[PDB]
């Protein structure tokens, strides 16, 4: 077990096209996957639109779609295939109703969204009724994903977190001493490597991204690299045509999935219950 974890320590970008990954996924023997979506409704979204979204809030409802609406739309166009039943569990976190402690379900009895159509539909209905708040932690959304996976009896899931990457940090700490939010988020990423769960951070807005890269590349304590960072605004910024960016997004999202899936098998997680994952209950959507 010691040697198999240092085999899956860090996962580089080992694929230059979507086709290479699609093939690597076949060769890996991936037959069934499900998506979970988490959306950052923290107040940082108010100022992380400075350069990338014209001094507006990333959650601003205008005449054209905001980076959250864009990401939901492009995830639906590129990854909807990887949810086998097209029912998407969708959760908000970091509004006044949840802060850094909970998540809320997009629909009432934690009814899953009917495709990315309803994820987008509901995002629009929900965000104007929210108070963007904080602090910012991924612990609750990762716990929610862990609970979904555990209750499924270890079915492979991909948690897609759309976020501005601004997790609460000690602005003056000189060494690498961690905020409570960082610490709990890291503990959650570590806990989640006991389960057949892949995480993909779809970054929107200006960054900075130092911490999302830390989560991507450098968490020694975890059983396998279960975290990919995708700079979605860097990709959409580029000069090339729309469909050529959609492809680059898809490649970047799926980049770590082949080795991650293999890890769930080699580490004896796929189709197993861990047994000791405390059940998390999502709050209802704000009304
Ligand atoms: Ca599903
Ligand atoms: Ca990684
Ligand atoms: Ca990576
Ligand atoms: Mg925040």
């Amino acid at each position: 077990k010691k040697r198999l974890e240092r085999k899956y320590s860090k996962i580089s970008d080992d694929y230059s096209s979507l086709e290479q990954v699609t093939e690597a996924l076949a060769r890996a023997g991936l037959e069934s996957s499900n998506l979970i979506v988490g959306i950052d409704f923290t107040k940082s979204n108010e100022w992380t639109g400075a350069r990338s979204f014209n001094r507006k809030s990333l959650h601003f409802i205008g005449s054209s779609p905001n980076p959250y609406e864009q990401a939901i739309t492009i995830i639906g166009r590129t990854l909807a295939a990887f949810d086998e039943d097209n029912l998407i569990p969708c959760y908000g976190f970091g509004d006044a109703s949840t802060h850094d402690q909970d998540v809320f379900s997009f629909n009432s009895e934690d009814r899953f969204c009917n495709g990315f159509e309803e994820v987008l539909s509901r995002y629009k209905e929900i965000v104007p009724q929210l108070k963007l708040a904080g602090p910012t932690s991924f612990a609750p959304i990762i716990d929610m994903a862990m609970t979904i996976v555990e209750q499924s009896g270890g079915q492979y899931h991909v948690l897609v977190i759309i976020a501005d990457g601004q997790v609460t940090r000690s602005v003056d700490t000189e060494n690498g001493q961690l905020s409570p939010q960082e610490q709990k988020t890291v503990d959650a990423i570590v806990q989640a490597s006991k389960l057949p769960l892949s995480i993909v951070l779809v970054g929107v807005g200006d960054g900075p991204w130092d911490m999302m890269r830390e989560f991507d590349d450098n968490i020694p304590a975890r059983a396998f690299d279960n975290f990919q960072f995708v700079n979605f605004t860097e990709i959409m910024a580029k000069n090339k045509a729309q469909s050529l960016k959609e492809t680059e997004f898809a490649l970047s999202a799926l980049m770590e999935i082949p080795q991650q899936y293999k890890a769930t098998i080699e580490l004896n997680l796929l189709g197993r219950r861990n047994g000791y994952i405390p059940e998390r209950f999502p709050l209802p959507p704000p009304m």
Side-chain angles (χ1 to χ4, degrees):
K1 144 164 146 186
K2 189 74 71 212
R3 100 239 155 176
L4 263 163
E5 287 185 14
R6 283 175 317 219
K7 177 178 178 185
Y8 285 115
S9 254
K10 185 200 215 211
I11 293 169
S12 309
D13 296 19
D14 293 339
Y15 307 101
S16 328
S17 82
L18 190 47
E19 293 72 46
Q20 285 192 57
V21 162
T22 318
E23 231 272 294
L25 284 179
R27 277 187 292 103
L30 177 73
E31 284 166 303
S32 175
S33 53
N34 279 271
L35 300 185
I36 308 163
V37 173
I39 288 173
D40 179 337
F41 291 116
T42 74
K43 194 190 172 73
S44 43
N45 286 293
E46 272 170 8
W47 63 75
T48 49
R51 305 186 228 95
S52 62
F53 194 50
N54 195 25
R55 259 168 307 100
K56 283 161 289 149
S57 170
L58 300 185
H59 288 294
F60 177 60
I61 299 301
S63 346
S64 70
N66 70 37
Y68 280 94
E69 292 176 296
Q70 276 163 56
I72 290 165
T73 289
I74 277 155
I75 287 159
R77 283 161 70 73
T78 64
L79 302 190
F82 290 76
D83 196 83
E84 88 173 12
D85 73 333
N86 212 247
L87 266 38
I88 284 66
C90 199
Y91 303 93
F93 65 92
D95 74 308
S97 85
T98 51
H99 304 109
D100 74 326
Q101 314 282 105
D102 293 293
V103 310
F104 67 79
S105 33
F106 267 34
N107 303 127
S108 299
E109 313 310 334
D110 188 28
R111 181 184 65 75
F112 301 166
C113 288
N114 297 312
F116 282 94
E117 292 77 46
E118 195 178 16
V119 169
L120 190 53
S121 127
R122 287 291 296 140
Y123 170 84
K124 287 169 179 162
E125 298 173 84
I126 283 166
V127 74
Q129 300 203 78
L130 251 44
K131 182 83 186 74
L132 304 186
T136 305
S137 164
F138 298 157
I141 182 63
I142 291 171
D143 276 320
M144 189 67 237
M146 283 168 71
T147 282
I148 285 156
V149 168
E150 190 69 350
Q151 282 175 356
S152 81
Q155 299 196 53
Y156 183 58
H157 284 77
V158 180
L159 173 54
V160 180
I161 304 171
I162 326 183
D164 75 358
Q166 306 314 128
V167 166
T168 289
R169 53 183 313 151
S170 29
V171 196
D172 296 317
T173 202
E174 280 166 317
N175 64 327
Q177 145 144 317
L178 289 173
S179 77
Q181 288 71 31
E182 277 177 276
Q183 192 50 65
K184 282 171 170 159
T185 292
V186 166
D187 293 342
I189 289 172
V190 172
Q191 264 312 115
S193 65
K194 298 204 270 162
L195 288 179
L197 179 57
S198 285
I199 309 174
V200 172
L201 195 297
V202 176
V204 283
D206 298 343
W209 302 114
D210 314 312
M211 218 172 343
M212 298 307 86
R213 294 198 188 96
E214 174 83 22
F215 293 165
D216 193 329
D217 294 325
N218 175 37
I219 297 189
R222 76 183 153 181
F224 73 98
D225 181 358
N226 59 352
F227 197 104
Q228 168 66 331
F229 170 48
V230 174
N231 191 331
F232 167 91
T233 48
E234 179 196 271
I235 289 172
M236 298 299 133
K238 285 177 180 191
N239 214 338
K240 62 190 87 156
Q242 183 51 16
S243 51
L244 219 66
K245 294 154 163 181
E246 295 201 4
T247 279
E248 201 199 334
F249 172 69
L251 164 60
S252 305
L254 298 170
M255 187 70 51
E256 291 195 39
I257 297 292
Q259 302 83 331
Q260 271 164 10
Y261 183 62
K262 276 169 211 212
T264 69
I265 298 165
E266 292 195 33
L267 287 176
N268 203 56
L269 306 177
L270 186 58
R272 294 209 136 100
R273 284 166 200 276
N274 166 280
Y276 306 105
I277 307 307
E279 179 166 7
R280 173 161 287 266
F281 300 103
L283 304 193
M287 262 270 292

